[PDB]
Design a protein around this nucleic acid. Structure first.
Ligand SMILES: [Mg+2]
Ligand SMILES: [Mg+2]
Ligand SMILES: [Mg+2]
Ligand SMILES: [Zn+2]
Ligand SMILES: [Zn+2]
Ligand SMILES: [Zn+2]
Length: 143
RNA sequence: GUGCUCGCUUCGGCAGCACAUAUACUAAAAUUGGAACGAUACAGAGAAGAUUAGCAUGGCCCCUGCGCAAGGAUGACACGCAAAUUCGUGAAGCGUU
Protein backbone atom coordinates (compact mmCIF):
# COMPACT_ATOMS: atom_id res chain seq x y z
CA UNK A 1 0.00 0.00 0.00
CA UNK A 2 2.42 2.87 0.99
CA UNK A 3 5.47 4.33 -0.65
CA UNK A 4 7.08 1.68 1.32
CA UNK A 5 9.41 3.95 3.15
CA UNK A 6 13.02 3.18 3.83
CA UNK A 7 13.60 4.98 7.11
CA UNK A 8 11.56 2.94 9.68
CA UNK A 9 11.71 6.00 11.94
CA UNK A 10 8.51 7.97 12.26
CA UNK A 11 8.16 10.81 9.75
CA UNK A 12 8.65 14.36 11.05
CA UNK A 13 6.26 16.95 12.41
CA UNK A 14 4.52 18.60 9.49
CA UNK A 15 4.01 15.36 7.60
CA UNK A 16 0.29 14.79 7.99
CA UNK A 17 -0.69 18.04 6.30
CA UNK A 18 1.35 17.39 3.14
CA UNK A 19 0.50 13.72 2.92
CA UNK A 20 -2.80 13.68 0.97
CA UNK A 21 -1.36 15.67 -1.91
CA UNK A 22 1.96 13.82 -2.01
CA UNK A 23 0.04 10.59 -2.12
CA UNK A 24 -2.14 12.18 -4.79
CA UNK A 25 0.90 13.14 -6.84
CA UNK A 26 2.19 9.63 -6.27
CA UNK A 27 -1.06 8.13 -7.50
CA UNK A 28 -0.74 10.26 -10.63
CA UNK A 29 2.74 8.86 -11.25
CA UNK A 30 1.48 5.29 -10.97
CA UNK A 31 -1.17 6.12 -13.55
CA UNK A 32 1.43 7.46 -15.97
CA UNK A 33 3.65 4.39 -15.62
CA UNK A 34 0.87 2.16 -16.94
CA UNK A 35 -0.48 4.29 -19.79
CA UNK A 36 -0.34 2.01 -22.85
CA UNK A 37 1.57 3.55 -25.73
CA UNK A 38 -0.69 3.60 -28.77
CA UNK A 39 -0.76 6.99 -30.48
CA UNK A 40 1.96 8.21 -28.21
CA UNK A 41 5.31 8.34 -29.99
CA UNK A 42 8.46 6.63 -28.81
CA UNK A 43 9.73 9.76 -27.06
CA UNK A 44 6.29 11.10 -26.20
CA UNK A 45 5.44 8.25 -23.86
CA UNK A 46 8.05 9.30 -21.31
CA UNK A 47 6.88 12.88 -21.17
CA UNK A 48 4.42 12.37 -18.25
CA UNK A 49 7.19 10.99 -16.03
CA UNK A 50 9.37 14.09 -16.26
CA UNK A 51 6.35 16.33 -15.83
CA UNK A 52 5.06 14.70 -12.65
CA UNK A 53 8.61 14.48 -11.31
CA UNK A 54 8.82 18.22 -11.89
CA UNK A 55 5.47 18.64 -10.19
CA UNK A 56 6.35 16.72 -7.03
CA UNK A 57 9.66 18.50 -6.71
CA UNK A 58 8.08 21.93 -7.26
CA UNK A 59 5.51 21.13 -4.58
CA UNK A 60 8.09 20.58 -1.83
CA UNK A 61 10.10 23.49 -3.22
CA UNK A 62 7.14 25.84 -2.92
CA UNK A 63 6.47 24.84 0.67
CA UNK A 64 9.98 25.31 1.99
CA UNK A 65 11.27 28.38 0.17
CA UNK A 66 8.19 30.39 -0.78
CA UNK A 67 5.47 29.52 1.70
CA UNK A 68 7.96 28.51 4.45
CA UNK A 69 5.53 25.87 5.72
CA UNK A 70 7.99 22.97 6.25
CA UNK A 71 10.98 22.61 8.57
CA UNK A 72 14.44 21.35 7.62
CA UNK A 73 13.60 17.99 9.15
CA UNK A 74 10.45 17.45 7.11
CA UNK A 75 12.07 18.84 3.96
CA UNK A 76 15.07 16.57 4.08
CA UNK A 77 12.81 13.65 4.88
CA UNK A 78 10.94 14.20 1.61
CA UNK A 79 14.20 14.37 -0.31
CA UNK A 80 15.51 11.16 1.24
CA UNK A 81 12.24 9.30 0.74
CA UNK A 82 12.20 10.16 -2.92
CA UNK A 83 9.48 12.79 -3.11
CA UNK A 84 11.69 15.64 -4.28
CA UNK A 85 14.78 15.85 -6.46
CA UNK A 86 17.76 17.30 -4.66
CA UNK A 87 19.49 18.12 -7.94
CA UNK A 88 16.52 19.76 -9.61
CA UNK A 89 15.90 21.90 -6.53
CA UNK A 90 19.56 22.89 -6.63
CA UNK A 91 19.17 24.22 -10.16
CA UNK A 92 16.01 26.17 -9.35
CA UNK A 93 18.02 28.23 -6.89
CA UNK A 94 20.33 29.36 -9.67
CA UNK A 95 19.61 32.67 -11.34
CA UNK A 96 18.37 31.82 -14.78
CA UNK A 97 17.49 28.18 -14.20
CA UNK A 98 14.17 28.55 -12.43
CA UNK A 99 11.49 26.79 -14.44
CA UNK A 100 13.78 24.00 -15.58
CA UNK A 101 11.95 20.81 -16.51
CA UNK A 102 14.63 18.22 -16.47
CA UNK A 103 18.21 17.73 -15.75
CA UNK A 104 18.49 16.38 -19.30
CA UNK A 105 17.47 19.64 -20.89
CA UNK A 106 20.63 21.36 -19.56
CA UNK A 107 22.95 18.41 -20.05
CA UNK A 108 25.42 19.15 -22.81
CA UNK A 109 26.63 15.58 -23.08
CA UNK A 110 23.20 14.48 -24.28
CA UNK A 111 23.21 16.53 -27.49
CA UNK A 112 25.01 16.27 -30.82
CA UNK A 113 26.84 19.56 -30.73
CA UNK A 114 27.50 19.84 -27.02
CA UNK A 115 24.79 22.29 -26.18
CA UNK A 116 21.53 22.67 -24.32
CA UNK A 117 18.15 21.95 -25.79
CA UNK A 118 16.13 24.66 -27.50
CA UNK A 119 13.78 24.22 -24.60
CA UNK A 120 16.29 26.47 -22.81
CA UNK A 121 16.31 29.27 -25.39
CA UNK A 122 14.47 32.45 -24.33
CA UNK A 123 11.26 32.70 -26.34
CA UNK A 124 12.00 36.26 -27.41
CA UNK A 125 15.12 35.09 -29.21
CA UNK A 126 13.26 32.73 -31.55
CA UNK A 127 11.27 35.79 -32.76
CA UNK A 128 8.69 33.97 -34.87
CA UNK A 129 6.24 32.19 -32.57
CA UNK A 130 7.32 28.72 -33.69
CA UNK A 131 5.83 26.02 -31.51
CA UNK A 132 8.36 23.75 -29.83
CA UNK A 133 8.19 20.52 -27.90
CA UNK A 134 11.52 19.39 -26.52
CA UNK A 135 12.13 15.77 -27.40
CA UNK A 136 13.58 14.83 -24.01
CA UNK A 137 10.97 16.51 -21.97
CA UNK A 138 7.99 17.79 -23.87
CA UNK A 139 8.76 21.25 -22.60
CA UNK A 140 7.76 24.43 -24.32
CA UNK A 141 10.26 26.99 -23.16
CA UNK A 142 11.59 26.81 -19.61
CA UNK A 143 13.43 30.06 -19.82
C1' G B 1 10.60 33.07 -15.93
C1' U B 2 13.02 35.30 -11.64
C1' G B 3 15.18 39.33 -9.17
C1' C B 4 17.20 44.17 -8.60
C1' U B 5 15.68 48.71 -10.05
C1' C B 6 16.32 55.02 -4.04
C1' G B 7 11.91 53.38 -12.72
C1' C B 8 7.44 55.77 -13.63
C1' U B 9 4.95 54.32 -9.12
C1' U B 10 0.69 51.71 -7.54
C1' C B 11 0.54 47.43 -5.27
C1' G B 12 -2.67 47.13 -11.33
C1' G B 13 0.11 47.84 -15.86
C1' C B 14 4.51 49.32 -18.27
C1' A B 15 9.92 50.77 -18.94
C1' G B 16 15.15 49.53 -18.36
C1' C B 17 18.98 46.10 -16.62
C1' A B 18 21.03 41.33 -15.10
C1' C B 19 20.88 35.97 -15.56
C1' A B 20 19.06 32.15 -18.68
C1' U B 21 20.93 31.03 -25.77
C1' A B 22 19.32 26.57 -30.40
C1' U B 23 16.69 19.41 -29.02
C1' A B 24 15.65 15.88 -32.69
C1' C B 25 18.64 8.93 -37.48
C1' U B 26 13.21 15.08 -36.96
C1' A B 27 7.18 9.42 -37.28
C1' A B 28 2.18 7.76 -33.52
C1' A B 29 4.05 6.63 -40.35
C1' A B 30 3.44 5.93 -45.86
C1' U B 31 6.18 3.07 -48.61
C1' U B 32 9.93 -0.22 -50.56
C1' G B 33 12.39 -4.92 -51.83
C1' G B 34 14.29 -9.74 -49.97
C1' A B 35 14.62 -14.15 -47.29
C1' A B 36 13.84 -18.78 -44.96
C1' C B 37 16.72 -24.51 -44.96
C1' G B 38 9.70 -27.01 -43.13
C1' A B 39 6.31 -30.03 -46.14
C1' U B 40 5.04 -31.72 -51.25
C1' A B 41 6.68 -34.78 -56.03
C1' C B 42 11.89 -36.48 -58.51
C1' A B 43 15.80 -37.93 -56.82
C1' G B 44 20.80 -41.63 -53.19
C1' A B 45 27.75 -41.35 -50.57
C1' G B 46 34.72 -40.21 -53.32
C1' A B 47 39.05 -43.38 -54.86
C1' A B 48 39.56 -47.69 -62.56
C1' G B 49 34.87 -55.48 -59.25
C1' A B 50 32.39 -54.94 -54.11
C1' U B 51 32.75 -52.71 -49.03
C1' U B 52 34.98 -48.72 -47.59
C1' A B 53 39.42 -44.72 -42.58
C1' G B 54 40.40 -40.48 -44.12
C1' C B 55 44.10 -35.77 -44.92
C1' A B 56 44.54 -32.20 -48.41
C1' U B 57 44.26 -28.85 -53.12
C1' G B 58 41.44 -23.96 -55.48
C1' G B 59 37.64 -20.10 -54.87
C1' C B 60 32.04 -14.87 -57.46
C1' C B 61 29.81 -22.06 -52.44
C1' C B 62 29.16 -21.82 -47.60
C1' C B 63 27.24 -23.82 -42.29
C1' U B 64 28.13 -25.06 -36.63
C1' G B 65 32.23 -23.10 -33.46
C1' C B 66 35.46 -17.91 -29.32
C1' G B 67 38.64 -20.29 -32.41
C1' C B 68 45.16 -19.33 -36.13
C1' A B 69 41.09 -26.13 -32.67
C1' A B 70 37.77 -29.42 -34.76
C1' G B 71 33.51 -31.02 -37.46
C1' G B 72 29.90 -30.51 -41.58
C1' A B 73 29.22 -37.56 -46.84
C1' U B 74 37.05 -37.39 -46.97
C1' G B 75 31.19 -30.59 -46.09
C1' A B 76 29.92 -29.78 -51.12
C1' C B 77 31.80 -28.46 -56.13
C1' A B 78 35.94 -30.69 -59.52
C1' C B 79 34.36 -36.14 -64.23
C1' G B 80 36.78 -32.56 -69.20
C1' C B 81 34.61 -34.51 -78.19
C1' A B 82 41.01 -32.17 -72.05
C1' A B 83 44.13 -30.14 -79.73
C1' A B 84 48.24 -23.39 -78.09
C1' U B 85 52.03 -20.53 -81.96
C1' U B 86 54.13 -23.96 -86.37
C1' C B 87 55.19 -28.53 -91.34
C1' G B 88 56.83 -31.73 -94.74
C1' U B 89 58.25 -37.00 -98.18
C1' G B 90 57.76 -40.54 -102.28
C1' A B 91 55.17 -42.64 -106.38
C1' A B 92 51.13 -42.58 -109.89
C1' G B 93 47.17 -40.55 -113.15
C1' C B 94 45.01 -36.31 -115.55
C1' G B 95 45.10 -31.26 -117.45
C1' U B 96 48.82 -26.88 -118.31
C1' U B 97 53.53 -23.89 -119.65
MG1 LIG C 1 37.68 -31.72 -42.24
MG1 LIG D 1 33.65 -41.75 -45.43
MG1 LIG E 1 36.91 -30.97 -48.39
ZN1 LIG F 1 14.40 20.71 -23.04
ZN1 LIG G 1 12.81 19.10 -19.86
ZN1 LIG H 1 11.96 22.94 -20.57
Amino acid sequence: MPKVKRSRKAPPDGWELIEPTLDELDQKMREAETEPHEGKRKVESLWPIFRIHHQKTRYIFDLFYKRKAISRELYEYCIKEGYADKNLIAKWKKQGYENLCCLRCIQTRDTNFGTNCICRVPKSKLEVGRIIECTHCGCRGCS
